[PDB]
């Protein structure tokens, strides 16, 4: 007598890497980066009309 | 280990200088987390409660000594966790009692007399770090004062510690403030000492519990029973369903009025006595 058990194929996934600037939403952002934001206290912007 | 408390924007010059003052004064935070808003710390987060609710609040919340205060955020080190990691944290007195070396320190709600930030539009009250032998008396004296207003004494306004006099008077608000402890301390004894009075005459269990009790209650409780039952007396009374309701209430106040020490003091290369206003080194873990 001969018997046995089998595994058939395993299956993974792939996490999709979403890059933000790919989205159409990247319009609304203007992204400039500080290397150091932390040290800064209140910063500002000036609007003249 | 340390947690961080961000200050919301719009901070004035004296209100930022108000937070510069309370460098090492104790803050209760809800849960240990990295980002943690300053509205969780403030007295708005405690709803205002009286001094029974503040004893209830300090057990569910997590005590944490503020370390250095940055302009952007307030950094605080928790007692239960980040003091097992970081060694020793400087702690500023706000008590009128000077701390000796080796004192287990507990914190007490401010019953006696409150930094308020106006631009952020919130208040802060801080606990009072005074030692645990005084803490179990000063709570008990203010209840003993409170019962006598419910009909005081010539003394009991006076306490001595380290040869120094304390003034518990410094009073009309305080008696209204601590009144809910009084209504629970009066109640817990009265339903306490009426279940005893209704159960010792009920059984006097015959075996050795009978001879052991009344011989030990000889002129201690058996005299005090008939001295009560002189101005007292001896359907179905709900005698057994009330011990459930009594032990649940009496074990509830035992957690409150314990005032467990969160802090011990091992000073090294310093004074054995830390005076008021000064900072004391604080550990609790070996």
């Amino acid at each position: 007598d001969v018997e046995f058990d089998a595994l058939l194929g395993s299956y993974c996934n792939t996490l999709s890497l979403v890059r933000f600037l790919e989205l159409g939403l990247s319009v609304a952002c203007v992204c400039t980066k500080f290397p150091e934001l932390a040290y800064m206290n209140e910063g500002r912007v000036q609007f003249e009309v | 280990f340390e947690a961080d408390i961000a200050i919301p924007s719009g901070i004035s010059r004296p209100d930022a200088a108000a937070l510069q003052r309370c460098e090492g004064r104790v803050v209760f935070l809800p849960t240990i987390r990295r980002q943690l808003a300053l509205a969780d710390v403030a007295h708005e987060s405690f709803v205002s409660p009286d001094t029974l609710g503040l004893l209830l609040a300090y057990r569910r919340r997590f005590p944490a000594v503020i370390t250095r205060v940055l302009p952007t955020r307030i950094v605080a080190c928790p007692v239960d966790l980040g003091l097992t990691h970081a060694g020793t944290v400087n702690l500023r007195n706000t008590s009128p009692v000077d701390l000796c070396n080796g004192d287990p320190v507990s914190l007490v709600p401010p019953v006696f007399e409150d930094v308020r930030l106006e631009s952020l539009d919130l208040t802060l009250r801080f606990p009072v770090p005074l030692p645990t032998p005084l803490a179990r008396e000063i709570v008990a004296r203010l209840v003993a004062r409170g019962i006598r207003d419910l009909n005081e004494l010539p003394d009991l306004n006076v306490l001595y510690y380290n040869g120094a006099r304390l003034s518990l008077v410094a009073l009309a608000s305080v008696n209204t403030e601590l009144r809910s402890l009084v209504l629970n301390m009066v109640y817990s004894i009265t339903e306490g000492t009426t279940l005893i009075l209704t159960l010792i005459p009920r059984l006097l269990a015959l075996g050795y519990v009978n001879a052991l009790l009344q011989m030990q209650s000889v002129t201690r409780e058996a005299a005090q029973l008939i001295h009560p039952e002189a101005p007292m007396l001896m359907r179905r009374l709900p005698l057994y369903e009330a011990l459930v309701a009594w032990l649940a209430h009496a074990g509830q106040l035992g957690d409150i009025l314990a005032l467990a020490p969160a802090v011990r003091v091992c000073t090294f290369d310093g004074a054995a006595v830390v005076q008021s206003g000064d900072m004391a080194p604080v550990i609790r873990y070996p």
Binding site: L15, L17, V18, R19, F20, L23, L25, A28, C29 | -
Partner: protein, 49 residues
Amino acid sequence: DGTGISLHRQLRAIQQLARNVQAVLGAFERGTADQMLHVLLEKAPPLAL
């Protein structure tokens, strides 16, 4: 140990980091696009008003 199994269980444990770090770093790009909506919405009143 001097076994092959021990060496094999690193490799299973090392490639467990890759499965995480990748899964994490991606959460920041997907994280920004989450803030922007949470930001822009707070800026925006309803048309009807």
